[PDB]
Amino acid sequence: ATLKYICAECSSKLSLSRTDAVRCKDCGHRILLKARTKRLVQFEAR
Amino acid sequence: EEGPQVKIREASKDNVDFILSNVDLAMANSLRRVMIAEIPTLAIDSVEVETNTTVLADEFIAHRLGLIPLQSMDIEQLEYSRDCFCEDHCDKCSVVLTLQAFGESESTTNVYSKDLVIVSNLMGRNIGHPIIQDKEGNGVLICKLRKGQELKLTCVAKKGIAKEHAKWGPAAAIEFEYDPWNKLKHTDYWYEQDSAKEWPQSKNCEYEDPPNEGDPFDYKAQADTFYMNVESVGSIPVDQVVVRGIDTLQKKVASILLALTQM
Amino acid sequence: KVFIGRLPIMLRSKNCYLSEATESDLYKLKECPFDMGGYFI
Amino acid sequence: MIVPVRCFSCGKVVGDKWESYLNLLQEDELDEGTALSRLGLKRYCCRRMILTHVDLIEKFLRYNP
Ligand SMILES: [Zn+2]
Numbered sequence: 001a002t003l004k005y006i007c008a009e010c011s012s013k014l015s016l017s018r019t020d021a022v023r024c025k026d027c028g029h030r031i032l033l034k035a036r037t038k039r040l041v042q043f044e045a046r
Numbered sequence: 047e048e049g050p051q052v053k054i055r056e057a058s059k060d061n062v063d064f065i066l067s068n069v070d071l072a073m074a075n076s077l078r079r080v081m082i083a084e085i086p087t088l089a090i091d092s093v094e095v096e097t098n099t100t101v102l103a104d105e106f107i108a109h110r111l112g113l114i115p116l117q118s119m120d121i122e123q124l125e126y127s128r129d130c131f132c133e134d135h136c137d138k139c140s141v142v143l144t145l146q147a148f149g150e151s152e153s154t155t156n157v158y159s160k161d162l163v164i165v166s167n168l169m170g171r172n173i174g175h176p177i178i179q180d181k182e183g184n185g186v187l188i189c190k191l192r193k194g195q196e197l198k199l200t201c202v203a204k205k206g207i208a209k210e211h212a213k214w215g216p217a218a219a220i221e222f223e224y225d226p227w228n229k230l231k232h233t234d235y236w237y238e239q240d241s242a243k244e245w246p247q248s249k250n251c252e253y254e255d256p257p258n259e260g261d262p263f264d265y266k267a268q269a270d271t272f273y274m275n276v277e278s279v280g281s282i283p284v285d286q287v288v289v290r291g292i293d294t295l296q297k298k299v300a301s302i303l304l305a306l307t308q309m
Numbered sequence: 310k311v312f313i314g315r316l317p318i319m320l321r322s323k324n325c326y327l328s329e330a331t332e333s334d335l336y337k338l339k340e341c342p343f344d345m346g347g348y349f350i
Numbered sequence: 351m352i353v354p355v356r357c358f359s360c361g362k363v364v365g366d367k368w369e370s371y372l373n374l375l376q377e378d379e380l381d382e383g384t385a386l387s388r389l390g391l392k393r394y395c396c397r398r399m400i401l402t403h404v405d406l407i408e409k410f411l412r413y414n415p
């Protein structure tokens with residue numbers, strides 16, 4: 001269902017805009033990870 | 047049948063200890079090289095990654111995937127994607143497989159080649175089936191998953207040769223020896239006190255007659271009688287590695303006579 | 310009482326939270342159990 | 351990280367012998383040399399592959415995320 005960001009610890013898929021600072025829900029981890037892409041990557045098997 | 051002559055000693059699904067005789071060292075070698083580098087095979091040569099929360103990197107995993115030996119019995123009934131007239135890959139030139147794994151249990155979940163699943167149409171040719179030789183039908187250990195981690199990949203096997211990448215090699219090693227009794231004097235034994243006492247006598251010294259003390263050097267003897275042993279990796283029956291070795295070498299020279307021709 | 314300045318703490322010294330941490334306490338904390346710690350951050 | 355799939359030098363498949371090797375040691379109380387020979391690793395190039403590997407993944411799996 002989409003997710004622009006993740007949380008450094010609770011893994012809970014966050015996702016907010018501006019003026020939202022940087023915190024998760026209950027896990028005030030001011031960290032947050034950017035979440036992978038859907039544009040699947042191809043790899044040489046070499 | 048007049049000419050090169052095979053004389054098998056051991057034989058199994060993995061090795062083929064034999065004795066080539068009545069041939070040029072050059073031919074024993076070219077054949078020896080061909081088996082190592084130019085026998086066609088199928089192998090994963092493209093991995094699309096949907097999900098990898100594993101502890102490894104995509105290219106890291108992908109690299110291993112390619113090293114996983116795949117069924118290449120009817121490899122000739124498959125074409126090189128570069129020759130094929132499709133756009134990229136198709137059933138006429140490629141085998142598609144899938145890998146989906148999830149860390150369900152709390153105990154470490156292992157991912158093996160057996161967990162690979164063919165998704166394309168093999169059209170009746172024995173090809174792409176991940177080789178398995180272990181005593182538990184598991185295959186190669188591709189990765190390990192902790193509870194919660196996931197791995198969703200999509201591979202694409204293609205025909206190739208060792209010259210392009212060692213993953214496409216059907217051979218594992220190739221023992222090769224001649225003149226076990228240093229009679230042609232091709233090598234000069236290094237020693238501290240005694241050549242003979244310091245150098246281990248080889249297997250094949252039994253299959254030959256030790257030179258006699260007073261015989262003058264035989265200067266016209268050439269090199270025939272080569273003791274080989276081929277170890278297959280599984281993607282192909284041992285007997286085949288050899289046979290097709292001779293085959294490809296044969297087609298090679300053929301491609302040349304045909305060059306002078308249409309020249 | 311009175312607050313007076315801040316003192317940077319050497320990892321794994323009596324003051325640090327890792328000094329008394331078990332192996333698993335270290336993993337959950339994302340700190341390699343192989344780390345020695347005679348430094349500051 | 352994990353058992354290399356093959357012997358760097360010859361190509362021998364080795365990534366399918368790690369667990370067996372581990373058992374040959376624990377549950378059978380054998381020695382590494384005797385253990386390795388029973389798995390078929392006869393030439394030292396292949397022997398070193400297994401005898402020298404370090405399974406650091408079993409430590410990576412211990413981190414939560
Ligand atoms: Zn949080």
Ligand SMILES: [Zn+2]
Binds near residue numbers: 130136
């Ligand atoms: Zn095609």
Ligand SMILES: [Zn+2]
Binds near residue numbers: 358360
């Ligand atoms: Zn080896």
